[PDB]
């Protein structure tokens, strides 16, 4: 009956599960104003992957496939393939291909391509707007804005590598991207399917605990805050361990190994998210060597000490 645990890793040793960048800090705030339903970094404590969540930190927000030029323009349509270059199956019971961005925004990166016959290669600046009418990865189509109108070839392996986010157009400072707004994965005016559920604190005085990174900015004044429910290493670890849950809630203590002292305690829910006892927006002040430790399976009778 395998014992549950969480990785012995500091926040800084870990990775954001919604963009391929490292974690930086811990944040808690009220989330009643918006719907918190990220599709990446969703995994149960007994190791069931949810939403669009997959194992590879480096595949998060990447796309692969072949491209078709949109005539006269610097825009290309990518016909998606799966992450191993095999055919993509739209009938799978997932919201979108695993690793698809789970927020509405403009993601800048690079499209790279290799020509199968002679091994010639090319790379170009590329931006995908995930709020676009033509953003339909569930259907196997996404559109990229590039800096070339001729260089990419048809029927050759093409990859998108994400770098950062931009705000352009007339959008006002830091009002894009919208990290808590899900894309419409099948394109405009279609409902999303097979989603990991929204999360909220239910107990009074409790707030979600967020694992926070700063996405790189490539242009303008973007909102670069990125919050995930679980670090990517926890997803990989729970998936690997697949330790049975003995109750709904795993009690975690954040421990400073230098002193042996407990900074605070929190609840890791079986469905894969964390809550703390705090009211208000707060950037947690944590020791550099601090890490999370699983201490026991509890229930609603256990009340968290104020953070």
């Amino acid at each position, epitope marked *: 009956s395998k014992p549950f645990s969480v990785p012995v890793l500091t926040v800084e040793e870990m990775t954001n599960s919604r963009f391929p960048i490292p974690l930086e800090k811990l944040f808690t705030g009220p989330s009643s104003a918006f719907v918190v339903q990220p599709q990446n970094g969703r995994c149960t404590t007994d190791g069931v992957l949810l939403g669009t969540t997959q194992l590879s930190p480096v595949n998060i927000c990447t796309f692969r496939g072949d491209v078709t030029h949109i005539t006269g323009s610097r825009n290309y349509t990518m016909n998606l393939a799966s992450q191993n270059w095999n055919d993509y199956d739209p009938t799978e019971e997932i919201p979108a291909p695993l690793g698809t961005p789970d927020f509405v925004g403009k993601i800048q990166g690079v499209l790279t391509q290799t020509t199968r016959t002679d091994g010639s290669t090319r790379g170009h600046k590329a931006t995908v707007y995930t709020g676009s009418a033509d953003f339909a990865p569930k259907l196997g189509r996404v559109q990229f804005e590039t800096d070339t109108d001729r260089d990419f070839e048809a029927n050759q392996n093409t990859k998108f590598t994400p770098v950062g986010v931009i705000q352009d157009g007339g959008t006002t400072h830091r009002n894009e991207p919208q990290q808590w707004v899900l894309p419409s994965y099948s394109g405009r005016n279609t409902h999303n399917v097979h989603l990991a559920p929204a999360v909220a604190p239910t107990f009074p005085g409790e707030q979600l605990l967020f694992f926070r990174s700063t996405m790189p900015g490539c242009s303008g004044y973007p909102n670069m805050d990125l919050d995930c429910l679980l670090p990517q290493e926890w997803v990989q670890y729970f998936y690997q361990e697949a330790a049975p849950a*003995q*109750s709904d809630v795993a009690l975690l203590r954040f421990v400073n190994p230098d002193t042996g002292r407990v900074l605070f305690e929190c609840k890791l829910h079986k469905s894969g998210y964390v809550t703390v006892a705090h009211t208000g927006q707060h950037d947690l002040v944590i020791p550099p060597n601090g890490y999370f430790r699983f201490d026991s*399976w509890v229930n609603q009778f256990y009340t968290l000490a104020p953070m």
Partner: nanobody
Amino acid sequence: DVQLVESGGGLVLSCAASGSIFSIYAMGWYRQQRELVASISSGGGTNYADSVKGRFTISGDNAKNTVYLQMNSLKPEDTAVYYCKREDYSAYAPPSGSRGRGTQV
């Protein structure tokens, strides 16, 4: 097994725990539909029902493995049977619950 050594309230509390007890736990009082009154957790967290909030106080002595409930400004709506409750928690097994027989107040 865990056994609970209570104490009583009369007319218009303490609960003491012994046995196969664990380092991580919660203890408190329910009353009778059956309703929560107050609980306290080993990490220091406390929870109160809205009706007794601000009037009744719960506290605990970890060494004796006992919890104390101070009932103040008692009202007719407080009349019920009050039973101590404890949850023992481990990293390897589901929570183990123990309940007192109950005391009329």
